[PDB]
């Protein structure tokens, strides 16, 4: 199976697999059953922003999800990630719908990884930033239903020609190049990610959510990973 | 008095004011009596590197001090810094000698602060990097004995025309511009700093150390802050 | 007198001091009489963006001023800037009104300077970015009429409590720290600047314009520099 | 055939295909016959640094190649690159030996591309930096003889187990992800690259050189591109 570390923006509470009874953000370490969650007052139809950070000295994975003027939700978890993940990874965004649905629209996405040793000049860094997505994004690996649309946005899940979201959809976008997130001689390894998103829905209880995730480089959408599994895991273990 | 947050590279153990009985790195929150320390196997005559990081989501101030091939020391402390520090600050390096002495030579120094809201474009950022220091550094506020020398290095404490360190010395260097490290509407505030240093000494027990610190913008060397107080505090409370 | 290098967004044609007969952007080297200009179809009431770049290898100062979907104007000039400017400078924005008027509202401003030698790690860099301006910007030197307003914007020229622009106004904002833009041992020196602006006016022929400029560190608004002189020069020579 | 833009550090003068009669740096636009060259006093056995820059406003491709304390060579050429290159590219380093030989050792390599529109936040950016190369660089496409060695350096051309260079060698390293270097709606597109290199040789006239190049994403070493052709072109046209 894949090896998965993820920050989930979980719009739909699946209490039968350990979700809290409200929409939440969570930190997922090799399981959909989040190691840490926080209540998320998500705002359908508003543009939100997520910021995710980690470094190997502090060993604290943190995320904040915000809507201008409305709400800020933070979640953190203490974990040695470079003990969980392989040394080379790909990074990506995932999203799903299930019986219930929502758009999972990514408006922008940026990421920075640094592998330091003894200097101000790092041993390695990778930074990418997209504030719009081209119609043929050659630096993205699109998986499942993920497409880019005429407005330059990344639609992780299926939307109709009029933009209405569809159920039973899964899609992911990985950055094309592998990322060297740890190396035995590194003094410190860090990563930071930001994305902005727009979740719209006609459902009373929209679903299922969006994640930023880090995985083995050959990661692919698991069989049976739809809906509540957010396109990351094959089961709810 | 000034308001001080600092990471100390403390070369001399002053057990009578709460130092551990070995050279150590420490996190100092408004007191020379570190809130957290780690044993530091410091290598006289070798170039070392310090990396310091913090963000307001994780609320964990961490530092790693390293010598290539030799040693790595890490220390962390959980603290809401933007509750300790004013909204505007200056950032700097300090060093001292006392009865015992050492060079406190800074070879390079970089710093980044970010004040984010809802976007990939921050509300504010400041980044500076020096890999050498000019003879008249107009973007530094030099305090006490601090000078720049013919090799382009920053000598925080007094050195002879032949480079031999002198006792009873204190010096600091602040970046000229104030730094906006928090603002009530910020989603996240972060800072990162790196410097490389060279501590040489003919003393069996060199002293006193080097710090990276953050203070009120009008910070100045306190009266009586020499030696064990590292040019940051007026007393050992 | 001051030593001035500037990119002017000149909204008002003063043909009697060498302006073209249309609104224009220009490159100014120690004179309001631009060394190079380009016609600027400026859009009152729309947010524009300016990008300015230079490096000491290419020795070409270039600027592009754009309005989304509407227009793009470019101007360039071949010049050895590090032969014109002192080694230490301050960088800033200026604006004026005269008999005719306009708002000179800066919404965001960023700047990067790099002083390189033999490595990927530079000898020096400075980067700052403002996507909003605080009510008390301690890292800006405000000169003349320049203020920051309740929306977080920088108003270079005087505006009424209702936002109506006033005539006979001059204002500038400098970054607080001096910038080391050349050094004899540098392999390459570069700078880049971006700002976004909003010019509104009830006048048929708004005036006078906005500049990004680089000057001696002790630069101040010259006597008699109002209106057509854009707060940069004491005369039209 | 491939579409090639390159900066060549040409150590061996092949006057029969248009080289100057001395080692030189050159700007190559779809031909090994450089559009612009400069004399290069290359220093065998010393570490050199190359810096390359371009932006679509200035439309000037420039390079500087330097040895600390010894020499600086600059070359520039005015060209609309985004009229020469496809919209998506890969970027890389190449090197060759022929009858004569040299090591073509890359010690570090960094690259930044920016695709801007109306804001401080770009429409796209990609930045990578390597100050050492891992034994299995999963973010590099190694072509021909290129390998990474035990010191963490990139050896573009073949070297013996003792480090002696071999003749008749060609090797290239491309960054894994494609790069979006132009887009019709971009206000400005820019790129910058730096690498440091070490050329050693026992030959009186070492050969053949190192390039930084930009090409169609599916670029590969052309048949017959050895020696004087630097692994970039199939012929000397
Ligand atoms: O899209 C939201 C959810 O829809 C389905 O689960 C249900 C939500 N309400 C229900 C009511 C009945 C049944 Br049976 C199911 Cl399976 C559900 C499943 O597709 C879940 O994986 C998904 O999280
Ligand atoms: O430079 C190292 C130290 O030297 C002095 O303290 C002493 C170190 N060994 C001693 C022995 C005797 C006395 Br009395 C003192 Cl005050 C010291 C003081 O200057 C200390 O502040 C300083 O940390
Ligand atoms: O604000 C626009 C201009 O207004 C004044 O110049 C005039 C513009 N139209 C005029 C008509 C008459 C006279 Br007299 C003047 Cl001085 C002007 C002067 O203040 C100029 O410096 C300025 O560029
Ligand atoms: O490595 C340097 C050069 O060696 C060969 O060319 C020669 C350099 N000196 C010569 C002398 C004779 C002949 Br025949 C050749 Cl082909 C050469 C060829 O391999 C060239 O492509 C290459 O640039
Ligand atoms: Ca769920
Ligand atoms: Ca001590
Ligand atoms: Ca004018
Ligand atoms: Ca040649
Ligand atoms: Mn969940
Ligand atoms: Mn201590
Ligand atoms: Mn003009
Ligand atoms: Mn040549």
């Amino acid at each position: 199976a894949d090896t998965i570390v993820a920050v989930e923006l979980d719009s739909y509470p699946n209490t039968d697999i350990g979700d809290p009874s409200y929409p939440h953000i969570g930190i997922d370490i090799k399981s959909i059953r989040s190691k840490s969650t926080a209540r998320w007052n998500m705002q359908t139809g508003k543009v939100g922003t997520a910021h995710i950070s980690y470094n190997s000295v502090a060993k604290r994975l943190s995320a904040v999800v915000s809507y201008s003027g409305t709400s800020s939700t933070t979640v953190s978890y203490d974990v040695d990630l470079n003990n969980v993940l392989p040394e080379w990874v790909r990074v990506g965004l995932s999203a799903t719908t299930g019986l219930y649905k929502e758009t999972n629209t990514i408006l922008s996405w940026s990421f920075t990884s640094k592998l330091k040793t003894n200097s101000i000049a790092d041993a390695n860094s990778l930074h990418f930033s997209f504030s719009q997505f081209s119609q043929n994004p050659k630096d993205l690996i699109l998986q499942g239903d993920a497409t880019t649309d005429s407005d330059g946005n990344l639609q992780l899940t299926r939307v109709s020609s009029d933009g209405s979201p569809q159920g039973s959809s899964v899609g992911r976008a990985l950055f094309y190049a592998p990322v060297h997130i740890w190396e035995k001689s590194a003094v410190v390894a860090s990563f930071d990610a930001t994305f902005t998103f727009l979740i719209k829905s006609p459902d009373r209880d929209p679903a299922d959510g969006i994640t930023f995730f880090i995985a083995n480089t050959d990661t692919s959408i698991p069989s049976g990973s739809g809906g509540r599994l957010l396109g990351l895991f094959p089961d709810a273990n």
Side-chain angles (χ1 to χ4, degrees), chain A:
Chain A
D2 287 347
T3 302
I4 301 300
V5 167
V7 174
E8 58 165 59
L9 281 52
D10 193 341
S11 56
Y12 186 87
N14 308 88
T15 47
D16 57 332
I17 58 158
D19 273 355
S21 77
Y22 37 79
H24 53 284
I25 66 174
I27 288 171
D28 297 355
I29 308 293
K30 298 202 289 188
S31 172
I32 195 69
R33 292 171 186 264
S34 306
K35 308 305 186 177
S36 181
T37 66
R39 184 184 305 253
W40 175 38
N41 296 354
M42 58 146 299
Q43 308 278 322
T44 308
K46 310 274 200 301
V47 172
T49 305
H51 303 284
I52 297 140
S53 57
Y54 175 86
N55 76 76
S56 64
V57 184
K59 292 189 170 63
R60 180 169 280 171
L61 179 58
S62 70
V64 54
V65 177
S66 60
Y67 290 99
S68 61
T70 307
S71 57
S72 195
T73 303
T74 53
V75 69
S76 292
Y77 184 62
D78 286 353
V79 57
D80 182 350
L81 283 185
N82 299 299
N83 193 76
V84 170
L85 289 165
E87 143 169 21
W88 287 94
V89 302
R90 279 197 164 96
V91 301
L93 305 171
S94 81
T96 52
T97 60
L99 177 61
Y100 302 139
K101 61 201 159 296
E102 75 198 19
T103 67
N104 293 118
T105 309
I106 305 296
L107 277 58
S108 67
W109 178 29
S110 68
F111 172 86
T112 303
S113 69
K114 295 188 178 296
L115 210 47
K116 301 211 213 289
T117 54
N118 297 80
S119 169
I120 291 173
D122 302 317
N124 168 81
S125 66
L126 169 76
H127 165 71
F128 62 84
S129 198
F130 314 116
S131 75
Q132 57 174 78
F133 296 91
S134 96
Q135 278 283 68
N136 178 23
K138 299 193 172 177
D139 52 3
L140 290 182
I141 298 160
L142 298 183
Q143 301 181 320
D145 294 339
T147 67
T148 59
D149 71 17
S150 53
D151 298 322
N153 291 324
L154 166 60
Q155 301 284 4
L156 291 171
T157 45
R158 187 67 62 202
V159 299
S160 290
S161 49
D162 67 356
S164 321
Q166 307 300 125
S168 302
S169 185
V170 60
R172 321 196 309 186
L174 323 177
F175 187 66
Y176 194 87
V179 183
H180 202 189
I181 52 153
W182 182 251
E183 201 279 328
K184 71 160 104 56
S185 295
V187 175
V188 47
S190 66
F191 64 83
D192 289 88
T194 299
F195 60 91
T196 63
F197 59 95
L198 175 59
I199 294 168
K200 296 191 287 188
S201 176
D203 295 7
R204 306 152 70 70
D205 294 289
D208 268 279
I210 297 170
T211 87
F212 166 80
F213 72 103
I214 306 180
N216 47 298
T217 62
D218 57 333
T219 180
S220 60
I221 294 166
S223 168
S225 63
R228 72 197 184 176
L229 294 188
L230 308 166
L232 302 177
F233 306 97
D235 56 58
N237 289 342

